[PDB]
Amino acid sequence: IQKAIEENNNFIKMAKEKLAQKMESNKENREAHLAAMLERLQEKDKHAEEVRKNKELKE
């Protein structure tokens, strides 16, 4: 009866740790994808500023 209790608890434990690891890893990956996209858009805003300056300093 103790072995049975232990096996049920180990199944609960391992599923809890696997789920938590997956959800954390997923959160980190999603946030990194959005941060890379935003960083590319910020590089665009930087390039648009360098364009507007080039145009100002052409005059």
Binding site: N8, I12, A15, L19, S25, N26, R30
Partner: protein, 440 residues
């Protein structure tokens, strides 16, 4: 006691839920307002139908059920429809934005925002049980919610209710009826992620249901309503042993013992008879023998595969209606002398038989004839692995090009989950091969 909680996930799960609960109401004489005049014990009882319905002090009989979808329009039809009074509003749970046919959104991005609420409502149902037996989970393989949220939920249920039994009714995708190209991805991801968390899963191949509706009901182009009414007849046959009393009734759990020789080998093939129109049923009474013979005709299977090219590991027959053992035994004797029924060598060949005398019911205005007697066979056959093969092949075709994979990666999944799931399916196909080999 020993109650059962039903959970209906995504569009297909919800709509099958609607067909199933409507049918249960008709079988037990429960009106759409929830009243049951034949039930003389007000507000409680330990009648067989209380495994699926609780009772309020006001005499309302309330499904032990949760409906969950990540968008609202299907469950909104339940909220406004004929049976809106059957369900407490807290049993009908909806988000605002669906999983867009993307497992990753149902399991992570959107699913994470509603999982705790869903668990709280399920907990509310469980606390009303004096001896909860387990869960029935209704969902498609192919939708974003039915795949990913169902997987998430199964994992959390294993945490919160331990080894408490969990059964699935799983809608297997077919190109013939409203499909998404990425459905094979979602199917492999959910089968992989749910495999260790499910004790028994009844797969329903939409192509099989579609063919049966066309061939036997003379329906040119079956709708979800036709398919779900038939599916509900199969579900009702399976749960009838839990919902009715009787001396020849045989518990579903007792069949489950026989249907599942190893934890992973837990996918029974369902076959149902008779599926016949009213026009063809007239002046043609189908006997125990005729319906039992039908059970071994592959055109009546719920999953397309050929049991004639595999081996049986179990074979149960669940009869309902005007059926006595004598006619069952004569029919089985005939089938044993006439058909290609080969068992693996490590398991006895006896068929397990249950009978329920409550007769089959049909929904009014339906396309199914009312019959005096019906039968559902549940067999554990290696041939069902063919359905995995078909699905695995479609997965491989797409995954070799990474087609559509960016939709999953963008929601936070990694390719490693794709290849892990696919390898788990490869090992499953190998298991089904190994169990069919003969002993030393």
């Amino acid at each position: 006691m020993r109650e059962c909680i039903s959970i209906h996930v995504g569009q297909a799960g919800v709509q099958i839920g609607n067909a199933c609960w409507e049918l249960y109401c008709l079988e037990h004489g429960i009106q759409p307002d929830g009243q049951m005049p034949s039930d003389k014990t007000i507000g409680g009882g330990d009648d067989s139908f209380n495994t699926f319905f609780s009772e309020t002090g006001a005499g309302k009989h309330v499904p032990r059920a949760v409906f969950v979808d990540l968008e609202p329009t299907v469950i909104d039809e339940v909220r406004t429809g004929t049976y809106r009074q059957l369900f407490h509003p807290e049993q009908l749970i909806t988000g605002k934005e669906d999983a867009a046919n993307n497992y990753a959104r149902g399991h992570y991005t959107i699913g994470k925002e509603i999982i705790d609420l869903v668990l709280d409502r399920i907990r509310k149902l469980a606390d009303q049980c004096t001896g909860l037996q387990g869960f029935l989970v209704f969902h498609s393989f192919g939708g974003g919610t039915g795949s990913g949220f169902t997987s998430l939920l199964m994992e959390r249920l294993s945490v919160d209710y331990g080894k408490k039994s969990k059964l699935e009714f799983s809608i297997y995708p077919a190109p013939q009826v409203s499909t998404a190209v990425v459905e094979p991805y979602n199917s492999i991801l959910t089968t992989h992620t749910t495999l260790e968390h499910s004790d028994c899963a009844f797969m329903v191949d939409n192509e099989a249901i579609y063919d049966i509706c066309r061939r036997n009901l003379d329906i040119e182009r079956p709708t979800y309503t036709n398919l779900n009414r038939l599916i509900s007849q199969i579900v009702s046959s399976i749960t009838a042993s839990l919902r009715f009393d009787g001396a020849l009734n045989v518990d579903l759990t007792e069949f489950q013992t026989n249907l599942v020789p190893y934890p992973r080998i837990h996918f029974p093939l369902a076959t149902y008879a008779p599926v016949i129109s009213a026009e063809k049923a007239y002046h043609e009474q189908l006997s125990v023998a005729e319906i039992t013979n039908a059970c071994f005709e592959p055109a009546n299977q719920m999953v397309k595969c050929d049991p004639r090219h595999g081996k049986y590991m179990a074979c149960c027959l669940l009869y309902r209606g005007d059926v006595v053992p004598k006619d069952v035994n004569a029919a089985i004797a005939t089938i044993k002398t006439k058909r290609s029924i080969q068992f693996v060598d490590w398991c006895p060949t006896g068929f397990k038989v249950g009978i329920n005398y409550q007769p089959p019911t049909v929904v009014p205005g339906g396309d199914l004839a009312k019959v005096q007697r019906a039968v559902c066979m549940l067999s554990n056959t290696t041939a069902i692995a063919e359905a995995w093969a078909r699905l695995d092949h479609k997965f491989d075709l797409m995954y070799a090009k990474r087609a559509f994979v960016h939709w999953y990666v963008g929601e936070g999944m990694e390719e490693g989950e794709f290849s892990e799931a696919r390898e788990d399916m490869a090992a499953l196909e190998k298991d089904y091969e190994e169990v069919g080999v003969d002993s030393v």
